[PDB]
């Protein structure tokens, strides 16, 4: 008997000698959760679920599904004590965001579950008030077209992390060498993945006795400093918000009083952004303080690293034009071209089904279903729902050429797929 | 030599491929070593069509001799008739620097023994071979804008002639594991000398799960069509590991940790869904399903375990061979 | 840093549009270099130089697709110059675009 | 200081870069393609 602090345990359903104790009169009362307050604290108490720890599981008999594992077949076993709610709840937070994670070679579900942390997106809806360092925020995040039924509980509709993109799987002029991706510069002009990167700066005034105060240094009364012109500094030594700072100009003109020494705090990395907000407070002790948030946009250049939900992190090789990107029979020119050879050895066939499901669910008009073990979405009836709109039911589609206008001898496989722009940028190092 | 080039050399150099008149004027524009003079084509009753082997003869730098065999060439094709003809158009023969026959692949354009890039380092130097790379790095890299080479999901689906037969193996695999459990649970299995009845049980049953893993592996490769785009990246040999697309189509196979199928974790039950005394063909790791059809929520856990034993060794074998080589220097 | 976008179609002070050089490999042939153009202007002149029967090699390439500089190579027969092909191939295209515009304006006035 | 723009042979000038020069990894050769990669 364990009355012990710090174990771990999980809730399962209960079986009573043949069948469940979850009966229809329960879940008709759960369904109206408002104005009946029958919310899981009357379902434990009525003896339908039960917490089971890791070492009574050594004594228990589970079933996967109440459908096939209660109907008598050739009598595998008949002494079921419990059943589980739905067997895709064994995946954690960042491993639930992968559509069809029973279709991935498991090095790639592990790979994505470490890239989900890095892919930027709107993180908390009060970044107007915050003063973080390292605040990335996209312009136009989109909830995904192909989704899991537990994104809703992971809170991934009010706060998404990427933009979809019409993606084609083609070899082309050759800038996609096995981990690379040809973008579309006349889509990047319309804000595609265009994001802001904030920044912050701590500045403790400290009186000690060499003490220092916020001020403006005249050049020929204060000691060593660069040729960082002091135009942007105000009457007291802080930059008012809305003053574009260039690379390496003074933002806080702090002077250790000595004639006086010089302790400017330069804009590092020479990003040339805009100073967006300045607050002035006291510290813990009674000394004046200031935080500064210098923001910069970052258009996706050549270099900035992208990755899907299906492993296979990639770069950005060259940015072509709508002029040059290969058009369909109907004037669609895909935003991103990924290499063919990245499929069969990285081994994600999740990427060829999400790319199929987004083509159904942008013509069926209903945001699709990619729960892990749903057993009702196989790739046969994704196909025959695609075939009821006038496409080819394997997702293929005739592109034309970009430069000549020749019909390509083979087809190309197109379809919208949710891409993430990571934080491994090419302007974090230059 | 990158994958994008080395696959597409197969498609450039069949008998099927003919370049009309304007496309020669581009694939001659992207050479560097070319002497300004257009070759005379093969066919001349329509528009005078140029075969892709004539233009690929123009890259090969001067007189170079070689004979290799493409990776599809049956060994029985070297009988009396059809010796130098070889009706699959395998058997690379480069006489006198001009490609007479044969499809190329990785086996005769990599750096191996007797290779056509190897021979062009032992006859022509190195600055004549660097041009032999930066010609093929353009004229097939920029012919491919007329072919494309996509991968739809139609390129990873078995037709129903074999897909139903590929289960007719595995429905007998799980039968012949029941046949050996109930035979050895009656003291009716003679222990092979060298090991006990335990270790000779496992070797007996890992025999019947690597034949059905391979009888569902040779009938899947042969059943793929001639237009199938996985076959263009395996026959062309540019991307090896032809076992890693036999798991797309047919059967993932066995899982292992420590070289053994999954040990009993809880108490003689590898997961809480099973009975005790389960030495069966699915309660220790073997996977009936393939990635196209999806994976059972048990078998998703077992492939999470086989992918963890091989995901660590990579983190170990960078502190092993990253240390021999900086010590042996 | 990233180049500004207007450098994909402009000639600054110091560039000529075309520089013409000969073919030192094969006689009675020539070579061009259009500055700051792309496949829009390149593929029309390649194609119209193929209808001329006294032209044996009409081709063009762009060296790198990063900056725009078309290279065009022409090989004509004897009894003809290859700077006379590349001048007549343009002046047949301007007779063409003068012929659609007089004909497509009519097909608006029938609506 | 255009008094000191003299240049006679023997001097050492430190230019930025051009094409054609050789840099180290093997030894590449600088061609200039304007972006950040």
């Amino acid at each position: 008997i364990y009355t012990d602090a710090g174990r771990i345990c999980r809730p399962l359903l209960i079986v009573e000698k043949q069948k469940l104790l979850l009966k229809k009169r329960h879940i008709d009362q759960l369904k109206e959760r408002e104005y009946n307050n029958y919310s899981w604290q009357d379902l434990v108490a009525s003896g339908v679920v039960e917490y089971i720890d890791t070492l009574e599981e050594e004594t228990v008999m589970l079933a996967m599904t109440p459908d096939d594992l209660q109907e008598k077949e050739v009598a595998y076993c008949s002494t079921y004590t419990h059943c589980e709610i739905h067997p895709s709840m064994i995946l954690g937070v960042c491993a639930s965001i992968i559509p069809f994670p029973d279709h991935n070679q498991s090095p790639r579900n592990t790979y994505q579950s470490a890239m989900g942390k890095q892919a930027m997106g709107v993180y908390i809806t009060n970044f107007h008030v915050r003063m973080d360092t390292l605040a990335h925020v996209l312009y136009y995040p989109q909830k995904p077209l192909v989704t899991t039924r537990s994104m809703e509980y992971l809170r991934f509709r009010e706060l998404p992390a990427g933009i979809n993109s019409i993606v084609a799987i083609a070899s082309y002029t050759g800038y996609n060498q096995e981990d690379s991706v040809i973008m579309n510069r006349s889509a990047v002009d319309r804000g595609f993945f265009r994001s802001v990167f904030y920044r912050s700066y701590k500045e403790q005034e400290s009186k000690k006795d060499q003490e220092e105060v916020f001020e403006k240094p005249t050049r020929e009364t204060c000691q060593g400093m660069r040729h960082a012109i002091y135009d942007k500094l105000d009457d007291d030594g802080l930059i008012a918000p809305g003053v574009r700072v260039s690379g390496d100009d003074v933002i806080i003109g702090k002077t250790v009083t000595l004639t006086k020494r010089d302790c400017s705090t330069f804009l590092r990395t020479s990003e040339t952004g805009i100073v967006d907000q300045v607050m002035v407070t006291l510290n813990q002790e009674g000394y004046k303080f200031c935080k500064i948030r210098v923001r910069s946009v970052r258009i996706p250049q050549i270099g900035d690293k992208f990755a899907s939900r299906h492993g296979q992190k990639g770069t950005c090789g060259i940015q072509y034009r709508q002029e040059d990107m290969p058009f369909t029979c109907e004037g669609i020119t895909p935003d991103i071209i990924i290499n063919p050879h990245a499929i069969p050895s990285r081994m994600t066939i999740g990427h060829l089904i999400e790319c199929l499901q987004g083509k159904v669910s942008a013509n069926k008009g209903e945001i699709g279903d990619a729960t892990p073990f749903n057993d009702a979405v196989n790739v046969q009836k994704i196909s025959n729902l695609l075939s009821d709109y006038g496409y080819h039911l394997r997702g293929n589609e005739v592109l034309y050429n970009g430069f000549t206008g020749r019909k390509i001898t083979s087809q190309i496989f197109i379809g919208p797929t949710y891409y993430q722009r990571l934080k491994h940028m090419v302007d974090d190092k230059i | 030599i990158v994958q994008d080039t080395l696959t597409a050399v197969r498609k450039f150099t069949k008998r099927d491929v003919f370049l009309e008149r304007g496309e020669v004027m581009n694939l001659l524009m992207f050479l560097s070593t070319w002497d300004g003079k257009v070759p005379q084509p093969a066919i001349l009753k329509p528009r005078p069509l140029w075969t892709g082997k004539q233009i690929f003869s123009l890259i090969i730098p001067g007189h170079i001799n070689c004979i290799r065999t493409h990776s599809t060439h049956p060994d029985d094709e070297d009988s009396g008739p059809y010796k130098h003809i070889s009706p699959g158009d395998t058997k690379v023969v480069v006489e006198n620097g001009e490609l007479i026959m044969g499809i190329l692949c990785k086996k005769s354009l990599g750096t191996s023994a007797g290779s056509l890039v190897h021979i062009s380092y032992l006859e022509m130097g190195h600055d004549i071979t660097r041009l032999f790379y930066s010609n093929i790095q353009t004229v097939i890299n920029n012919w491919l804008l007329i072919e494309g080479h996509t991968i739809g999901i139609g390129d990873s689906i078995a037709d129903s002639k074999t897909y139903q037969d590929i289960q007719n193996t595995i429905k007998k695999a799980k039968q012949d594991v029941i046949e050996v459990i109930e035979k050895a649970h009656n003291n009716e299995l003679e222990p092979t000398p060298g090991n006990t009845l335990r270790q000779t049980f496992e070797n007996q049953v890992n025999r019947i799960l690597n034949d059905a893993r391979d009888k569902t592996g040779s009938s899947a490769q042969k059943s793929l069509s001639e237009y199938n785009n996985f076959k263009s990246m395996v026959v062309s040999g540019a991307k090896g590991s032809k076992i890693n697309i036999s798991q797309v189509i047919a059967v993932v196979g066995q899982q292992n940790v420590e070289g053994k199928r999954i040990p009993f974790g809880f108490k003689h039950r590898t997961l809480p869904h099973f009975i005790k005394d389960d030495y069966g063909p699915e309660s220790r790791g073997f996977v009936e399903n393939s990635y196209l059809a999806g994976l059972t929520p048990t078998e998703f856990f077992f492939h999470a375990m086989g992918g963890r034993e091989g995901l660590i060794d990579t983190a170990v074998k960078t502190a092993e061979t990253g240390y021999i080589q900086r010590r042996l220097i | 840093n990233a180049p500004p976008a207007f450098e994909s179609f402009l000639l600054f002070e110091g560039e000529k549009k075309i520089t013409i050089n000969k073919d030192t490999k094969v006689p009675n042939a020539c070579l061009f270099t259009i500055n700051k153009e792309d496949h829009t202007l390149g593929n029309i002149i390649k194609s119209q130089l193929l209808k001329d029967p006294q032209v044996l090699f009409a081709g063009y390439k762009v060296p790198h697709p990063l900056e725009h500089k078309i290279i065009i190579r022409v090989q004509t027969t004897p009894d003809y110059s290859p700077q006379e092909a590349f001048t007549n191939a343009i002046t047949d295209l301007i007779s063409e675009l003068s012929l659609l515009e007089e004909r497509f304006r009519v097909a608006i006035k029938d609506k | 200081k255009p008094s000191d723009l003299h240049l006679q042979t023997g001097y050492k000038v430190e230019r930025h870069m051009c094409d054609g020069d050789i840099v180290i990894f093997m030894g590449h050769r600088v061609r200039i393609l304007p972006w950040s990669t």
């Binding site: 050549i302 770069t315 090789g317 | 790379y133 | 840093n1 | 840099v23 600088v30």
Partner: peptide, 22 residues
């Protein structure tokens, strides 16, 4: 110090150094 990106239009013994680095 920056990224390498693929580019098949350079003769092998070449590198593209951008003008903020050269």
């Amino acid at each position: 110090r920056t990224v390498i990106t693929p580019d098949p239009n350079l003769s092998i013994d070449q590198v593209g150094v951008p003008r903020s680095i050269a």
